[PDB]
């Protein structure tokens, strides 16, 4: 049922609903000679909806925009970026400019600025200690601890039990580590306990990138995280 | 107009004409969570045809053979598989089911079977050091040194100035190092070397995955993995 990274040509932007009120979105990208899907959500508030995360990059987010008015036809009134590369801030220039409010912790925003990338306008206040969590709307954000970044936040809706990791965890097909250049290595598999510990009871497991499973991604992205520390 | 990543279904083969007689073959696969593109060639020998590499498992060598029938419309009567990996052994009990004669180096050969991949049925002799070429058919294969893999072949169609490098050549858009666990980083821009003096000659290069381009993608190659060297 769950768009594959096959099924998706590069430009165009599909929506999976999951429960009432909850969708993911999935774009593709070429990188490096290789095409990557990549996932994000969106949550019903009211009559608005939040986005977590871009579609990666300005013409994958307007027409993530587009889509959204197609399906859905509700307004993005906010969005979230998970942390600051390219891939979850590349299109929050066409989210504001549309008039979508877009927000980060200053973490994300500061190494955003840092590596040149676009920069939510927002500073999400409360995440700034490993285990915090605020709730934002629809959903609560939770900073896990460094993992795949330092900065990463993780999402969970708890009217339908979903959680979305980020690129902080890997889907099941993903057998070697992405980029690690950021990372923190020695202290992701902590942090990703630390998920495990705050949403036992997430049902449904969206990674940054590919197939949505159940719990089973945190131990793998554990597994296949301490397999590339001792590489 | 060469077929890109993005244009060909999982499963599906595309042959791009190069010259009388020379073609090149190109599929996809996922592996790791993302498509990648795959290369080989398919040279004239006669009324025959010499297959260079499979196209990267079972389905989609079947698709390459089902290809060949229909667009060509001569048998493939041998084929040289480049290195021991999925992505050039994959499919050889397809082309031997078919009646292919499947060739690799012993080096190849002894390598596969330790990985428990297909293994070409016939052994290249002469190919055992490096600078070593032995003529094939059209073709002739060189022993660049170890690159990618110890076991690498590149391939020269003389008749048309086309060298195949197999996975020891990138794209351009290529500009971060592929799987180098099996790789000799130390070597493979001496290898890339010994390629470029052998064949000063080639006018159309084409790496294992992705678009051909000229000689300047042996400089693109060694930019690459000596920056992978140096981090
Ligand atoms: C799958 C990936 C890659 C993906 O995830 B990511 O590291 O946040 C990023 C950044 C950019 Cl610029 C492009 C693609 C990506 C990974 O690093 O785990
Ligand atoms: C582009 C690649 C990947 C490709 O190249 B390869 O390393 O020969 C291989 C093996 C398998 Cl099993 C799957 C995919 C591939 C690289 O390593 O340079
Ligand atoms: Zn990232
Ligand atoms: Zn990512
Ligand atoms: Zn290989
Ligand atoms: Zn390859």
Redesign the interface.
């Known amino acids: 049922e769950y768009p594959?990274?096959?099924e998706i040509?590069?430009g165009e932007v599909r929506l999976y609903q999951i429960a009432d009120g909850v969708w993911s979105h999935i774009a593709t990208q070429?990188?490096?000679?290789?095409?990557?899907?990549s996932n994000g959500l969106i949550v019903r508030d009211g009559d608005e909806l939040l986005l977590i995360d871009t579609a990666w990059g300005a013409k994958n987010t307007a027409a993530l925009l587009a889509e959204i008015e197609k399906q859905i036809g509700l307004p993005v009134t906010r969005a979230v970026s998970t942390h600051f590369h390219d891939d979850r801030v590349g299109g929050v220039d066409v989210l504001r400019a549309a008039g979508v409010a877009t927000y980060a912790s200053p973490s994300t925003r500061r190494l955003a600025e840092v590596e040149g990338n676009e920069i939510p306008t927002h500073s999400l206040e409360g995440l700034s200690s490993s285990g915090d969590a605020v709730r934002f709307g629809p959903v609560e954000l939770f900073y896990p601890g460094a993992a795949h970044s330092t900065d990463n936040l993780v999402v969970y809706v708890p009217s339908a039990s979903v959680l979305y990791g980020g690129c902080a965890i890997y889907?099941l097909?993903?057998?070697?580590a992405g980029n690690v250049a950021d990372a923190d290595l020695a202290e992701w598999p902590t942090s990703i306990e630390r998920i495990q510990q705050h949403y036992p009871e997430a049902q449904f497991v969206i990674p940054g990138?590919?197939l949505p499973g159940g719990l089973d991604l945190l131990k793998h992205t554990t597994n296949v995280v301490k397999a590339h520390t001792n590489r």
Do not use: L
């Open positions: 594959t990274v096959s040509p590069v070429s990188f490096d000679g290789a095409v990557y899907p889907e097909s993903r057998t070697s990138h590919g």
